[PDB]
Design a binder for this molecule. Structure first.
Ligand SMILES: NC(=O)[C@H](N)Cc1ccccc1
Lengths: 300, 237
């Protein structure tokens, strides 16, 4: 079980860790988060009390280094940093634990939610979507645009999700125009799975990461990517049976976790109705269709 | 964006454009079977591709053999249309290719866009106009060549005959859409108007009669009357 210490909390802020969150008052004696489960990526995220604008945060994996948070009064945000002196870090953390100045990652033993939301998400893939190679952790915020969004402006601060475009030469084989547009299996299985992602695990990892950035930061380009990656599978007549079963599990837990009061914006009516009721895979997402109908029958 | 009343003069500027109408591509008769069920029999159809500035009509005849063994024919017809329009564009010299293609039905947008991915600079546009191009098969010479075709065939016409010698393309398109609207509303009446005076003939190389300027004003007036008339006979006004 690992720890992310905070130097201090100089401004009032709502701090999230994965799907949890808590309020820290201005200059409250807060020195970080302990008992963070090893084996998963994690995200620590922030919304200032004064400016609820810009949610921002950091994706990290405590197996890759010792990380801490320190507020920067010049840039005006809580920054993640790596401590390279391992003895210094253990000593800092042990002292904060002795003074009981840390919150505990509050995981229920029965509860597999975070595993289920991050099953295929790997730090190494995150760091290719979010390019900043001098750090082992990755910054994301509400405003960052995607590579594809920029094509339709600062490249260093972009989300390099795989570009998916259903009316593109990449998606449409010359002479199979109608076939490839109406049944996207070629584009899913040959172009994307075999060609670009290499396997379905990396596909699902990017889909899961996009969903989580949409949910935690309200990142619009991330929501677009998540729905595009769903629609590409649902609009393929030929999908490996194991991918469909796993997709149903993935989407189930994403819909289960979504705040009820944010569905209006984070869920695209056209994509979900098409996917659950019109697409080739309309009968292959039993768990997802059941939770969607019981929780958001309005959208449908 | 879309083409409507507000931007109507764009049709007659010097940027090459084509209307594409797919109404008459997939044509059927519906009939009873010996068992008392219903079936369709396809008949030959056509793509109506028209340069509104020059009157050049590229009439691609769709022979019934193109449907043999195919399913979901109304959906296929849109993709076949887009295939043939893309093939036409590729066949034209670069300096003759359109800079825009306006489709008379919105369901042609995605098929045509996909078939034209190789032409990113050709704009594919819908229209808010309710253009009467379906009535093209009420023009006897066009109907005749479509029904006689025994194989796929492209037939080239000028739908304005020689009118551009005397009138502008705006006025020519207005006359054409007036004639076609009339033929679409009451084909029998419209055709009676056009042929009533046997001394005004249709040249062998033309589609419409050889009216003088004065006679076209009379004709155009009669077509207007017809359209309002039928509009009363239909609505009771
Ligand atoms: N056959 C012809 O010369 C027509 N009079 C003019 C024309 C040319 C090219 C396409 C359609 C119509």
């Amino acid at each position: 079980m690992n720890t992310v210490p905070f130097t201090s909390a100089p401004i009032e802020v709502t701090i999230g860790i994965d799907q949890y969150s808590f309020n820290v008052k201005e200059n409250q004696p807060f020195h970080g988060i302990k008992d963070i489960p090893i084996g998963h990526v994690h995200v620590i995220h922030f919304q200032h009390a004064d400016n609820s604008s810009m949610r921002y945060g950091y994706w990290f994996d405590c197996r890759m280094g010792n990380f801490y948070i320190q507020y920067d009064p010049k840039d005006g945000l809580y920054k993640m940093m790596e401590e390279r002196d391992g003895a210094k870090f253990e000593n800092i953390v042990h002292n904060f634990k002795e003074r009981q100045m840390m919150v505990s990652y509050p995981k229920i033993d029965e509860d597999d939610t975070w595993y289920n939301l991050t099953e295929f998400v790997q730090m190494d893939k995150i760091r290719k979507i979010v390019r900043k190679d001098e750090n082992q952790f990755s910054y994301v915020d509400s405003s960052m645009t995607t590579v594809q969004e920029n094509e339709l402006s600062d490249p260093a601060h972009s989300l390099n999700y795989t570009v998916i475009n259903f009316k593109s030469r990449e998606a449409i084989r010359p002479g199979h125009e109608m076939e490839d547009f109406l049944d996207k299996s070629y584009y899913l299985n040959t172009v994307m799975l075999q060609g670009i992602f290499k396997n379905s695990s990396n596909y699902f990892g990017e889909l899961q990461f996009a969903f989580l950035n949409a949910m935690f930061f309200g990142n619009y380009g991330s929501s677009l990517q998540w729905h595009a990656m769903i629609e590409l599978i649902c609009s393929s007549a030929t999908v490996p049976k194991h991918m469909l079963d796993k997709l149903d599990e993935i989407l189930y837990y994403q819909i289960k976790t979504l705040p009820e009061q944010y569905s209006d914006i984070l869920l695209n009516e056209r994509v979900w109705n098409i996917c659950l009721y019109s697409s080739f895979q309309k009968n292959s997402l039993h768990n997802t269709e059941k939770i969607m109908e019981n929780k958001y029958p309005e959208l449908l | 964006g879309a083409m409507n009343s507000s931007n109507y003069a764009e049709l007659f500027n010097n940027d090459i454009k084509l209307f594409v109408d797919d109404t008459n591509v997939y044509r059927v008769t519906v009939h009873k079977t010996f068992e008392g069920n219903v079936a369709t029999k396809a008949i030959n159809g056509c793509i109506f591709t028209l340069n509104p500035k020059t009157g050049h009509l590229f009439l691609k005849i769709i022979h019934t053999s193109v449907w043999a063994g195919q399913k979901r024919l109304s959906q296929l017809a849109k993709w076949k249309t887009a295939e043939e329009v893309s093939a036409l564009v590729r066949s034209l010299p670069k300096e003759e290719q359109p800079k825009q293609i306006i489709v008379t039905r919105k369901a042609m947008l995605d098929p045509l866009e996909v078939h034209m991915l190789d032409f990113p600079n050709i704009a594919i546009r819908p229209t808010e106009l309710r253009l009467p191009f379906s009535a093209a098969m009420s023009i006897d010479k066009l109907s005749d060549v479509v029904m006689k075709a025994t194989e796929p065939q492209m037939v080239l016409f000028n739908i304005y005959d020689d009118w551009l010698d005397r009138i502008s393309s705006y006025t020519a398109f207005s006359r054409l859409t007036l004639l076609l609207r009339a033929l679409k509303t009451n084909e029998e009446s419209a055709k009676m108007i056009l042929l009533s005076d046997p001394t005004i003939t249709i040249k062998s190389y033309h589609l419409w009669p050889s009216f003088t300027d004065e006679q076209w004003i009379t004709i155009e007036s009669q077509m207007r009357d017809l359209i309002l008339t039928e509009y009363g006979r239909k609505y009771n006004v």
